[PDB]
Amino acid sequence: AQAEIEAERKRAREELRKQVAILAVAGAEKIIERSVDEAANSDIVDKLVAEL
Amino acid sequence: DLDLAKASATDQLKKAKAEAQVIIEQANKRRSQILDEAKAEAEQERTKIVAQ
Known part of the structure; x- marks a missing residue:
């Protein structure tokens, strides 16, 4: 019965990590869509051309 | 007398053989x-x- 619980600790830990990890990117999307609306775009488009 | 004693012991011996099984x-x-x-x-x- 012990390995049967060890597996469950691993599985619950992973279950939680999944949710945190997707909510992170959802939050980054909205935050990014609030803050690049300015001339900040001109930097991005100029950044790759120096490496393009 | 001998015949009768032998038959009487014989049946008891059957019962011993059977109850060793039971x-x-x-x-x-x-x-x-x-x-x-x-x-x-x-x-x-x-x-x-x-x-x-």
Whole structure:
């Protein structure tokens, strides 16, 4: 019965990590869509051309 | 007299031969039961610890 619980600790830990990890990117999307609306775009488009 | 004593001992000997079977063939189903009860004991124990 012990390995049967060890597996469950691993599985619950992973279950939680999944949710945190997707909510992170959802939050980054909205935050990014609030803050690049300015001339900040001109930097991005100029950044790759120096490496393009 | 001898013939009669021999028949009387003979039937008793049949009964000895048969009850040597009855005792241990009861003991064998009991040997089974003693362990198959432990199966239930430990299975419920495992399930209880896992539930806890």
